[PDB]
């Protein structure tokens, strides 16, 4: 589909910006968001809900 030029440019841009470099599926990509976001429990709204 995409030209190898665009493919390599996109991967180089990902390397530059610190994004995921290797190809990956949606199921495995969940880990990135899981570790980027805080756990639901650790959020102040969640663990300090009650005074």
């Amino acid at each position: 589909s995409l030209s190898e030029y665009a493919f390599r440019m996109s991967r180089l841009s990902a390397r530059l910006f610190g994004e995921v470099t290797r190809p990956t599926n949606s199921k495995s990509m969940k880990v990135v968001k899981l570790f980027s976001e805080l756990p639901l429990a650790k959020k102040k709204e969640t663990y300090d809900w009650y005074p």
Binding site: N25, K27, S28, K30, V31, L34, F35, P39, L40, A41, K42, E45, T46, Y47, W49, Y50, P51
Partner: protein
Amino acid sequence: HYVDWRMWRDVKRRKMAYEYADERLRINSLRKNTILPKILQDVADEEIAALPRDSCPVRIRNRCVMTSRPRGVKRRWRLSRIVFRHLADHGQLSGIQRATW
């Protein structure tokens, strides 16, 4: 001295979930991916099951902080609709006003 035993149970659940969130996140990261071996994912599954029941985040219920109402709780204020109406109508909440348009 929480409002009721239900609110006390929810407080216990929130404390347990906050305690075990990091371990839960770590163990669930292994399970929620298609890279690691299936045997490793299965052992991770049994471990996350082995974690205590109350640590599950889905068991945290958003009860009103003042009357322990299990439903009709506005998240932004954490108050059941009844208590929120009481305070807003008496004018003790900034900005909120009776809407007319």
